[PDB]
């Protein structure tokens, strides 16, 4: 009996699933109300990732691969925080490819005009030498 | 029916002012006539309406009847 | 009576076309084509082998 099934695998909301909100804050599920509202708590010490405990809608939230294992259902702020610095959610969130992309976005939006001109000129250095490399690979084959 | 390949004449939903005014006049006459028949109505009506009661699926209904009996006994003792 | 657009009459005509008049028309066709063929037989840029360009618009004029 050989079975080859190629299908989809959604990230699944569960107690301990970590959500990213639109403001950059991070939270974790502590209790499931319904399929459109959840109870989430962000105990992170970093203020940018902090989220006050309360109800958030799933439409107002995203899905991250971080899940806190063995997190009790309905755990309060102290227990969720003990699990949070037990698991190191902040470090894994920084290692995820999303937080790099938003951090790169503030590194774009915080630029001065002098910073933009420096970006232009350093990019021109990199593109000149990349065009030289491009000539070497194109000449080889 | 052959409605898909050969449709018939459409039914217009665009109301006319004459029809709207006539319908409004008949409607107001109907409320006035129902008021007159309610005033002249000889059908018997109860002084106290039929109470619907308490739903059976209510989980604390037995507790509510406990408080009902307790309050009735307390009122009887007070009176 | 059945119409000219009747499905049964159309199927009868299709069977007639495939089974009866078909070989007759094919034999006449091949003999006429034989007579007509009998009468008929009785660089890339510089040579024209390569199809080059000859010697209202769909796009917005910009």
């Amino acid at each position: 009996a050989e079975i080859n099934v190629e299908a989809t695998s959604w990230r699944r909301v569960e107690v301990g699933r970590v959500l990213k909100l639109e403001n950059g804050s991070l939270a974790a599920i502590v209790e499931i109300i319904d399929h459109k509202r959840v109870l989430a708590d962000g105990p992170s010490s970093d203020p940018k990732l902090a989220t006050p405990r309360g109800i958030v809608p799933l439409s107002r939230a995203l899905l991250t691969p971080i899940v806190i294992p063995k997190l009790p259902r309905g755990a309060r702020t102290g227990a969720v925080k003990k699990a949070w610095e037990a698991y190191g959610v902040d470090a894994k969130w920084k290692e995820t490819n999303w937080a790099k992309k938003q951090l790169q976005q503030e590194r774009r939006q915080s630029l001065t005009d002098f910073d933009r001109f420096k970006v232009m000129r350093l990019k021109k250095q990199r593109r000149f030498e990349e065009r030289k490399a491009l000539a070497k690979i194109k000449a080889a084959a | 029916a052959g409605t898909i390949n050969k449709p018939k004449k459409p039914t217009s939903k665009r109301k006319t002012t004459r029809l709207r005014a006539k319908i409004s006049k008949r409607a107001a006459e109907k409320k006035r006539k129902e008021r007159k028949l309610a005033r002249k109505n000889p059908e018997w009506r109860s002084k106290l309406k039929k109470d619907p009661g308490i739903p059976n699926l209510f989980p604390y209904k037995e507790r509510l009847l406990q408080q009902i009996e307790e309050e009735r006994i307390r009122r009887k003792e007070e009176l | 009576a059945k119409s000219a657009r009747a499905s049964r009459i159309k199927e009868n005509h299709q069977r007639f076309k495939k089974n009866i008049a078909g070989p007759v028309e094919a034999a006449r066709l091949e003999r006429l084509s034989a007579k007509l063929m009998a009468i008929a037989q009785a660089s890339g840029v510089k040579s024209g082998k390569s199809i080059g360009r000859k010697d209202s618009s769909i796009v917005f004029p910009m």
Partner: protein, 190 residues
């Protein structure tokens, strides 16, 4: 109400191989292979166990949940078709004019064609073409019997229905004129 989760199970035999990609179910067995596209129903296919297909639906309605049973039965019918096959046997009876039935296999299509003649003395020849993969044979153990076999239950039963429906008595009393071809027995090849 909207159902949070609903699941169904499909057992698979050891000789049957199942491939599911973009809801295109391929079921391969000893007798051949069958293909069926099921992209019109929102269903999650999974491997919950060795030899068990899991059908799942999330946040669906009652009709969407009830479609899973139809999906299960079609998949099980494909499995039964590639494993044991499907066989419909029909009988044809006549009162006075013997029905002359002839079965041939067209080379350029690969499909079977059945010609029926002398149906209540009619001079027309009724030609019915089977679906591909359906084999028609004259039974030799019994009298006036056609046997249709294949891997697709829908195709075999539809060909049997077409053979039954091509011989319809017209403008006569059906209590008196009993002529026709009728599907008698349904089962598996093995």
């Amino acid at each position: 109400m909207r159902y949070i989760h609903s699941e169904e199970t499909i057992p698979v035999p050891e000789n049957v191989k199942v491939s599911i990609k973009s809801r295109l179910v391929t079921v391969e067995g000893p007798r051949g292979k069958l293909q069926k596209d099921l992209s019109h129903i929102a269903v999650n296919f999974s491997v919950v166990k060795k030899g068990v297909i899991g059908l799942e639906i999330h946040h669906g309605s009652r009709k969407d949940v009830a479609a899973l049973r139809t999906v299960r039965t079609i998949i099980n019918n494909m499995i039964i078709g590639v494993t044991k096959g499907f066989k419909y046997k029909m009988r044809y009876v006549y009162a006075h004019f013997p029905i002359n039935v002839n079965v041939e296999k067209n080379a350029e299509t690969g499909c079977y064609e059945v010609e029926i003649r002398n149906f209540i003395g009619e001079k027309i020849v009724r030609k019915v073409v089977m679906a591909p993969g359906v084999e028609v044979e004259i039974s030799k153990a019994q009298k006036d019997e056609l046997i249709l076999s294949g891997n697709s239950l829908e195709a075999v039963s539809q060909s049997a229905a077409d053979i039954q429906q091509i011989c319809k008595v017209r403008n006569k009393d059906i209590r008196k004129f009993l002529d026709g071809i009728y599907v008698s027995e349904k089962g598996n090849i093995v």
